[PDB]
Design a protein around this motif. Sequence first.
Motif: not given
Length: 359
Positions: A250-263
Amino acid sequence: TTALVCDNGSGLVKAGFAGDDAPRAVFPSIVGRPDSYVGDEAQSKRGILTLKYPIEHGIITNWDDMEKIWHHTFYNELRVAPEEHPTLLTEAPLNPKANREKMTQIMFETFNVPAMYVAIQAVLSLYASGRTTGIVLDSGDGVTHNVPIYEGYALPHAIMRLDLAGRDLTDYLMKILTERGYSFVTTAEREIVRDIKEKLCYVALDFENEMATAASSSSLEKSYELPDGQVITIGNERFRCPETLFQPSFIGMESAGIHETTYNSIMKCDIDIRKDLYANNVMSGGTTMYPGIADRMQKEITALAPSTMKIKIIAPPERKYSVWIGGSILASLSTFQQMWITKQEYDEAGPSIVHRKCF
Ligand SMILES: CO[C@H]([C@H](C)/C=C/N(C)CO)[C@@H](C)C(=O)CC[C@H](C)[C@H](C[C@@H]1OC(=O)C[C@@H](O[C@H](N)O)C[C@H](C)C[C@H](O)[C@H](C)[C@@H](OC)c2coc(n2)-c2coc(n2)-c2coc(n2)/C=C/C[C@H](OC)[C@H]1C)OC
Ligand SMILES: Nc1ncnc2c1ncn2[C@@H]1O[C@H](COP(=O)(O)OP(=O)(O)OP(=O)(O)O)[C@@H](O)[C@H]1O
Ligand SMILES: [Ca+2]
């Protein structure tokens, strides 16, 4: 002689005395210049001051201005002589060893503390929940981390970092509202948008469903009174803004979201401890305050995790101050007193004693 606890954040310093139930001092992590003003001094003298932020995504990066922040903490806010108090400082997960060594050098050589310690923020938050095993999601103004912890100790190989947190969410809301035709540019205007974010934003349980609701009814619209009495109304911006945590695109970052990083963090850990991590996901930091976020995390982790693993998201109401509170607890314990780095120990070995006594 009471110990001090200073929780150094990208946006806010939280400081006080060990044993207290909340920090007595909470002020912005800012140094302002037209000699120099720190904290509240720099915020309530808007516009004419340019600001520097000595802590960037959780890491101290401007050491001279950081010293000003520490001076302001001891002398202006808490009204203490640092040489009379053991001082516990906090640091980000994966803080460089040389950084922790510099924090130590400054406390002893500049402030002449009798003793000090540096503790990992997310670990302190876990302690403040009454746990020594679990996985913390810590999200503040500057950075977000996932930190799995076993029997009191972080598992560094499994830590995840996302440079997306509260200031990016405020900036995004500012952008959205600026595009809708409002004027929000100055640091005073940033403060207004931050307030709108904090008062009106929430995390949708199902983002697609919520977008459809907002498109078909006015039931999600909420209004906000600006400082001159004029009214602004937002609807889907309320949940699009924090959705960015789950969808950094949504702000142009390629990163995994916080649910994905948690998992992903849990999956880096020993299979034999994952059940305990899944049942002990603790949220920490101001950016975890959005209504709906715990339930959303629960759903998203359930979608990824093995079936029937008990997933539990713990969202303490005091989580804006969890890191500080964990420090207040830790620094108060009888068993901790042997753990302080003393000035004598530092003279004997040097600033590199910190690696043998802290994480
Ligand atoms: C000694 O440290 C080692 C190790 C060597 C260090 C490792 N690292 C640092 C690794 O990185 C480490 C493994 C370890 O032992 C850490 C222990 C944790 C700090 C922590 C310790 C326990 O501590 C705890 O388990 C912490 C919890 O207490 C209880 N009894 O469960 C906190 C609560 C659940 C919530 C608050 O009550 C609530 C948020 C609020 O309540 C009004 C509140 C706000 O401030 C406070 N409470 C407050 C401030 O100071 C205190 N509370 C305090 C001062 O001392 C005490 N509490 C003592 C409490 C007794 C507890 O036992 C039940 C205490 C032993 O356990 C999770
Ligand atoms: N109710 C709320 N809803 C959404 N965001 C909030 C709320 N309250 C505070 N915040 C945000 O929390 C952030 C401050 O949190 P915190 O003090 O945990 O961060 P920090 O320690 O300064 O930063 P970091 O841990 O990223 O270095 C700010 O971005 C603030 O706008
Ligand atoms: Ca923080």
